[PDB]
């Protein structure tokens, strides 16, 4: 691994602190601004919708990316959540209640078994079955997110190939003539320290760069920095124009 | 079907002529600027890379989207062709020689059978096996492109679900927070009349709009118009911002 303490400027410039981790697939070399925070584990929050989606698809809890999950009629604080969703829009708008019902149907035994097979973080689901990724005992670091994401990219996780392709479709975030981004955001607010996440990868013509970013997030006002800081580093390193 | 002549403004501004065809999947209604040209058949040229990809994958000529197809060492006029490619970059850069080798390995009997199964245009492959979509007997209209693409979107073509998801991945062209475009360009120059194509669809949160465009292309100078004129119509109908 390679440490560049100069990169810390991107976080301090915004009066916060955090970590960016990059991985070059062709050369098999990793880069970060801070090796210790790169290996520090946090609640995954909505980045857990990647493994949760995979498990639900493989077990038949979700039939495909078109199946409609009806609003239960309870008015919640996020307007985007108070409507019907399929897998694509539930990912895009990070619809917590849809995923809470997934976890209930998967069950404790099958959830635990899958995460052990995935080698996902500390593999620990202690807490409520329907909120453990929000205020329970599961933890994962930026470097661990990278390792998990590399297996998904190569279809190496122990679920069907079909499941892995459908989730990668649902992760699609941005695309143009120069690159494709597949990724997922997160915001952990229930337990200190509050942090924001962005994890995923960038597909180029002849290479792939994996990334995992997190940063302290005392208020929701700074959530855009999740993407902004990551893109600033990528542009800096000439990965994107 | 419904005719909207106001769209002609977008063509005449550039002193050229053509057709745009749109299909609203939610309501099952079609729209076009020229009912007559919408049904006129042309060579598919590089839009034929969609069915050619599906067939190559389903028969194992292509193992997956990562398999590398080596350059044959002949320097052709388009520099981007003179190098190694996989399925994703061969679609992106319209690499004719890679697909000419696909066709040779598929063979006449299996190609023909697949096109009958797909209801693809006039289903006629007469000519050279390695160039019939460029200067042989196959023909397809803008309206027939729509029908074929609808089958693909719904995984209804007579190949595996997997083959269909991989080609849809390879068609990925643009994506942002407002929409996703999966499509393929074409440029028919060997046989008159010279034309340009852009065929595919736009994915929204709650609907999908299919599109098929062609226009006269006496010179390469106007190739950028395939996308800009299509985009102009979409903007007018408030489908994209
Ligand atoms: Cl995709």
Numbering used by the authors:
A (entry chain A), B (entry chain B): 25 to 265
Authors' description from the paper:
The carbapenem-hydrolyzing class D β-lactamase OXA-436 has been characterized as a mesophilic variant of OXA-48, with an observed average thermal stability of 53.8°C and an increased response to changes in temperature when compared with OXA-48.
We solved the crystal structure of OXA-436 to high resolution (1.80 Å) with good overall geometry. There are four molecules in the asymmetric unit (chains A–D), and the differences between the chains are localized at surface-exposed polar residues. In the β5–β6 loop, there is only a difference between Val213 in OXA-436 and Thr213 in OXA-48. In OXA-436, a hydrophobic environment with Val213 and Val120 surrounds the R 1 phenyl ring of ampicillin. From the crystal structure of OXA-436 determined to 1.80 Å resolution, we have used molecular dynamics to explore the differences in substrate hydrolysis, with a particular focus on the α3–α4 loop and the β5–β6 loop as tuneable elements for the substrate selectivity of the OXA-48-like group of enzymes.
